[PDB]
RNA sequence: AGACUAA
C-alpha cells in the first residue's frame with residue numbers, strides 16, 4: 001500500500017512476466033505517470049530488467065523526470081538533462097525516437113520490460129512502436145505495460161476525474177475577437193486553451209495579451225523555454241497545441257477546447273495524394289485527454305471544461321493508419337519477423353500485409369527522407385519506393401501540370417544549388433509540405449538541394 | 452497540421 005503521492009512498496013509480480021502485456025487504463029490524474037510508473041521502475045531495477053520507458057511528447061517526458069528523479073535512468077530526450085554514466089539499465093525516450101532507432105543503423109537494446117505511457121497516441125510512429133512491442137511480448141522476449149486513460153476503442157469524452165468538473169458547451173473563437181466573448185477574460189483562474197496550430201495559437205495569445213492577461217504559449221517550438229514557466233511561476237493562460245494534450249499537470253482551473261483539428265488524408269480518387277482536411281472534430285480520446293488536464297485536484301472543486309461541438313470517433317481516413325504500416329513494414333525483430341500492429345489497431349486500413357516493405361537502399365533512403373529531409377512518412381515512402389536516391393531532387397520538378405505549387409497565387413520557382421531556375425512541381429503531392437508557409441519554406445530548401 | 456530529434 002501507499003500514501004502521499006509516493007509509489008507503492010508493493011508491485012504485482014505478474015506485470016514482469018514475459019508474454020504479459022498489461023493495460024493500465026486508469027482515469028486521468030489517477031497516478032499512472034507519477035505514482036505507478038516509479039513503483040514499476042524501482043521494482044524493474046531490483047529484478048535487473050533492461051527497461052525502456054516511452055513518453056509521447058517532451059511534456060510527458062518532463063512529468064516522468066519529476067517522478068523518477070534520483071533513479072539511475074538514461075534520458076534520451078532533449079527535454080531532460082543530465083546524468084550519465086552509460087551503465088544505466090533503464091532508458092527513457094519519446095515514442096517517435098524509439099521508432100526512429102528501430103528504423104536506423106543502430107540496434108536497440110534487448111529490453112526485457114517496455115513501459116509505454118499514453119499507449120493510445122495515434123501518431124504513426126507511436127502506432128508502429130506498439131506493433132513492435134506487442135510482437136516482442138507475443139514472441140516471449142519481453143513484458144510490456146501500456147498506460148492510458150483512453151485505450152483504443154475509447155468512446156467516452158467525459159471520464160472520471162479526481163475532482164468534479166463542470167462541463168460547459170459554448171461557442172469558442174478560432175481567431176481574434178473584438179467583442180462578445182467576455183466569459184473568456186472575466187474568468188478569475190488559470191486557463192489551458194488548446195489550439196489546432198501554432199499560428200492559430202499566436203493570434204489567440206496576442207488577443208489575450210491586449211487585455212493584460214499573462215499568456216504562455218506552448219508547442220514544439222517553444223517547449224524548452226516555456227514549459228518551466230508553466231511550473232515556477234504564475235500565469236493566466238496557457239495557449240497550447242496538442243503537445244500538452246496528454247499527461248500535463250498544469251494546476252489549472254479551466255480548459256477551453258474547441259475540439260477541432262486538421263487531419264492529413266490520403267486521397268485515392270485519381271493520382272494518390274495527401275491533403276489537409278478540416279478543421280474536423282477531434283476524437284473522443286483527444287476530447288477526454290484535453291478535459292483531463294483539469295479536475296485533477298480533489299481540494300479544488302470548481303474546475304471547468306468549456307468545449308464546442310461533438311467529437312468524431314471515425315478517423316479511418318487519417319493518413320496515420322497507413323503511415324504506421326509504412327514504418328512497421330520496415331521494422332524487424334532480431335529473429336527475423338516483421339511486427340504486426342497491436343491488436344485493437346488492426347484493419348483500420350485495408351492491409352495488405354507487407355505491402356510497404358522496402359529493399360536495400362530504398363529503406364535507407366526512406367529513413368533519410370524523414371530524418372534529414374524532414375518529409376512526411378507518406379511522401380518519403382513514395383520517393384524511396386520509386387528507387388530515387390536521397391540527394392536526387394529531380395522528382396520535385398517532374399510532376400504533372402496540376403502539381404505546380406502556388407504561393408500568394410504565383411507559381412513557386414526554385415533556384416537550385418547548381419543555379420537552375422525551376423518551377424516547383426513535385427511528382428507526389430503532400431499538402432503537409434506546402435500548405436503552411438513555414439513548411440513550404442522548408443520544402444523549397446529541400447527542392448533547392450540545401451537540405 | 453500536430454508530434455519526435457536518438458546511438
Ligand SMILES: Nc1ncnc2c1ncn2[C@@H]1O[C@H](COP(=O)(O)OP(=O)(O)NP(=O)(O)O)[C@@H](O)[C@H]1O
Pocket residue numbers: 026027028029030031032033034035063148149162246247248249292293296297
Ligand atoms: N507537481 C505536482 N504537485 C502537486 N500535485 C501533482 C504534481 N504532479 C502531479 N500531481 C497530481 O498527482 C495526481 C497524479 O498525477 P499523474 O501521475 O500525472 O496522473 P496520470 O494518471 O498519469 N494522469 P493522465 O496522464 O492525465 O492520464 C494528479 O492528481 C495530479 O494533479
Ligand SMILES: [Cl-]
Pocket residue numbers: 248249250251252293296297
Ligand atoms: Cl494538475
Ligand SMILES: [Mn+2]
Pocket residue numbers: 032033034117246247
Ligand atoms: Mn500521465
